[PDB]
Amino acid sequence: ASSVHWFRKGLRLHDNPALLAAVCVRCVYILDPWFAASSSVGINRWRFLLQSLEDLDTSLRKLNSRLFVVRGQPADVFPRLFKEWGVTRLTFEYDSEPFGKERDAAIMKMAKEAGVEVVTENSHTLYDLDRIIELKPPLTYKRFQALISRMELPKKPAVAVSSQQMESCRAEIQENHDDTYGVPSLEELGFPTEGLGPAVWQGGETEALARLDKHLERANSLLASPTGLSPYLRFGCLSCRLFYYRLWDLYKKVTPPLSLFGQLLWREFFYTAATNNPRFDRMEGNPICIQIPWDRNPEALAKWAEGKTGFPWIDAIMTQLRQEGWIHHLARHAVACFLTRGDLWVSWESGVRVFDELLLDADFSVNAGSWMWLSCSAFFQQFFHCYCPVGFGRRTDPSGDYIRRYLPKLKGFPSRYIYEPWNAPESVQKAAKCIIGVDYPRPIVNHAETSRLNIERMKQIYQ
């Protein structure tokens, strides 16, 4: 048959169900390079996508095929491409997200009218999210535990695709193909590349599967680790089911507690809650979200996103996120708490956008979920689960080296004062050679006063 596998997501060949289903097969990614020119998402996540797409082309080229990166909007492209190659069927991995499902319903219909078969497999999640909802979406991590404990075990990693079977259905190779359907570049997509150094989080399934093996084998915690698999799970370079059962296999050599699958269940929990929540990213029109009257301060958001709040632990976290695309989960609770219920009283929706632009592992599902969790807007009620913009830093890194690596103007400050610089002697400031209100910004709020007011406003919302 003439089958098209849409690698819109799950940028992997290992544990790929729809790949085996479609197996003449042509692997397509559809990218609108003008949408990409006007994207608010920064260079780090766009680079990850391209590098991941480059890896599958490299992998497909090993199997005598190539990745067809078609340009344009998907609904306009598929019918002409259907007629161009006489596509017998189109196979794409199912998208839990509502906006994707609405787009996928239109393509599945357009194929139905056009007589093209459509097969969808949701290898992005460990389990069916729609199963759990019938069993209203689970609104607590515990009730969600309870429904997955009543649910069957998640599916095991999927089967491989043979090199001989792939050669049998290898697609037509043209010399012009590397230019026609070749993977785009950052400069093609509107990004300036001058001075761009080697990426901290290299994209692709090859890197991910390599990091899998390195991770299982084993303050710096806050720095990027070669073990880190957060972005590779978000794009699909690594399977949720492979990571689940390879972790299970290591535990058996070392019955599983929930603690190993915490990243995946927290991931799953938000994926379940969002499939049928259309405004999941928004406060209004959202059944699960508390209608908190969040203030609008455009200048606070700016100082928060631009790493200039005066609080070194906050500003160093935002600086790493801007520069590298990944911060530690405890660092995210820090900056989320500062922006929302802890200090600035700005909507979690504003934080969802900044993270979507800068963070490699942001989804519609995982991002809005975490932000509703911190803000105590949903799933969560412990409005005292509080983080000091000073104390949390000194407790995570007493050395202050994290600040020194990402805010080097404060490098000379001694550890006793590096998380709280306004409260430091001008003697030690001048020795550090960092001015109190020139070289670095001063605290834009006072945390003690502000935090007290915000709980009081928070408690009144519960009634």
UniProtKB/Swiss-Prot annotation:
Deletion phenotype: Animals show longer circadian periods. Double knockouts of CRY1 and CRY2 show slightly decrease body weight and lose the cycling rhythmicity of feeding behavior, energy expenditure and glucocorticorids expression. Glucose homeostasis is severely disrupted and animals exhibit elevated blood glucose in response to acute feeding after an overnight fast as well as severely impaired glucose clearance in a glucose tolerance test. When challenged with high-fat diet, animals rapidly gain weight and surpass that of wild-type mice, despite displaying hypophagia.
Region (Required for inhibition of CLOCK-BMAL1-mediated transcription): 345-444
Glycyl lysine isopeptide (Lys-Gly) (interchain with G-Cter in ubiquitin) crosslink, residue number(s): K9, K101, K214, K303, K430, K459
Cofactor details (free text): Binds 1 FAD per subunit. Only a minority of the protein molecules contain bound FAD. Contrary to the situation in photolyases, the FAD is bound in a shallow, surface-exposed pocket. Binds 1 5,10-methenyltetrahydrofolate (MTHF) non-covalently per subunit.
Phenotype when changing D295R: Strongly reduces PER1 binding
Modified residue annotations for Phosphoserine: S65, S225
Subcellular localization(s) per the UniProt record: Cytoplasm; Nucleus
GO BP field: circadian regulation of gene expression; circadian rhythm; entrainment of circadian clock by photoperiod; glucose homeostasis; lipid storage; negative regulation of circadian rhythm; negative regulation of DNA-templated transcription; negative regulation of glucocorticoid secretion
Effect annotated for changing V352M: Reduced interaction with NR1I2 and NR1I3. Significant decrease in interaction with NR1I2 and NR1I3
Tree of life domain: Eukaryota
Impact when changing K459R: Inhibits interaction with PER2. Does not suppress its nuclear localization. Inhibits its repression activity on CLOCK|NPAS2-BMAL1-driven transcription
Expressing tissues: Expression in the retina is restricted to the photoreceptor layer (at protein level). Expressed in all tissues examined including heart, brain, spleen, lung, liver, skeletal muscle, kidney and testis. Weak expression in spleen.
Broad class of the protein's primary localization: cytoplasm
Self-association state and partner proteins as the record states: Component of the circadian core oscillator, which includes the CRY proteins, CLOCK or NPAS2, BMAL1 or BMAL2, CSNK1D and/or CSNK1E, TIMELESS, and the PER proteins. Interacts with TIMELESS. Interacts directly with PER1, PER2 and PER3; interaction with PER2 inhibits its ubiquitination and vice versa. Interacts with CLOCK-BMAL1. Interacts with BMAL1. Interacts with CLOCK. Interacts with NFIL3. Interacts with FBXL3 and FBXL21. FBXL3, PER2 and the cofactor FAD compete for overlapping binding sites. FBXL3 cannot bind CRY2 that interacts already with PER2 or that contains bound FAD.
Job description of the protein: Transcriptional repressor which forms a core component of the circadian clock. The circadian clock, an internal time-keeping system, regulates various physiological processes through the generation of approximately 24 hour circadian rhythms in gene expression, which are translated into rhythms in metabolism and behavior. It is derived from the Latin roots 'circa' (about) and 'diem' (day) and acts as an important regulator of a wide array of physiological functions including metabolism, sleep, body temperature, blood pressure, endocrine, immune, cardiovascular, and renal function.
Protein family according to the UniProt entry: Belongs to the DNA photolyase class-1 family.
Protein name in UniProt: Cryptochrome-2
Organism name: Mus musculus
